[PDB]
Amino acid sequence: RRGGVCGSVWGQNDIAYRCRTCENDPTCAICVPCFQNGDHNSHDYSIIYTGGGCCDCGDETAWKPDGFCSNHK
Amino acid sequence: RRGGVCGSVWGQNDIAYRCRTCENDPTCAICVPCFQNGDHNSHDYSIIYTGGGCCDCGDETAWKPDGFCSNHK
Ligand SMILES: [Zn+2]
Ligand SMILES: [Zn+2]
Ligand SMILES: [Zn+2]
Ligand SMILES: [Zn+2]
Ligand SMILES: [Zn+2]
Ligand SMILES: [Zn+2]
Numbered sequence: 337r338r339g340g341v342c343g344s345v346w347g348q349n350d351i352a353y354r355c356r357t358c359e360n361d362p363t364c365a366i367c368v369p370c371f372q373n374g375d376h377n378s379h380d381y382s383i384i385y386t387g388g389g390c391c392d393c394g395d396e397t398a399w400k401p402d403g404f405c406s407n408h409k
Numbered sequence: 410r411r412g413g414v415c416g417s418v419w420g421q422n423d424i425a426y427r428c429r430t431c432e433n434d435p436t437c438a439i440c441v442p443c444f445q446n447g448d449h450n451s452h453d454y455s456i457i458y459t460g461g462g463c464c465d466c467g468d469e470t471a472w473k474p475d476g477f478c479s480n481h482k
Contacts, residue, residue: 340448341448341479343448343479343482345474345482346411352411361410363410363411363412364410364411365410365411384411386411387411387412388411388412389410389411389412389482390410390479390482392410395479398410398479
């Protein structure tokens with residue numbers, strides 16, 4: 337739609353998605369909802385325990401824009 | 410990303426941002442970089458001369474967490 341960074345926050349043992357195809361570096365990650373509302377088919381992704389932090393969806397400095405979800409473009 | 414308080418220090422006449430929507434009390438403030446890397450759209454913020462002190466971004470005791478920047482969550 338017309339018109340944001342996700343910024344959703346993880347606690348120590350919250351899971352997220354690592355996508356090695358979309359990440360700017362090895363510490364980037366996106367929340368499960370942003371992963372499920374994007375397109376990572378044939379990407380090299382894995383479920384991870386975050387150790388805390390925040391989702392990088394929407395942040396071009398941390399995540400490749402073709403990897404953004406429908407809500408953070 | 411995965412993984413802090415900002416703690417950046419101001420001198421007497423250094424500017425920072427007051428955000429009345431995010432602050433825990435009237436003496437809190439965040440540095441310009443933390444302001445620019447957060448989301449305060451439609452918040453009641455102002456540029457101020459600090460009189461010294463330190464940025465509250467990342468410190469839940471001084472600043473509402475939805476007001477933190479991308480680097481201090
Ligand atoms: Zn997200
Ligand atoms: Zn997203
Ligand atoms: Zn991907
Ligand atoms: Zn700061
Ligand atoms: Zn910050
Ligand atoms: Zn604010």
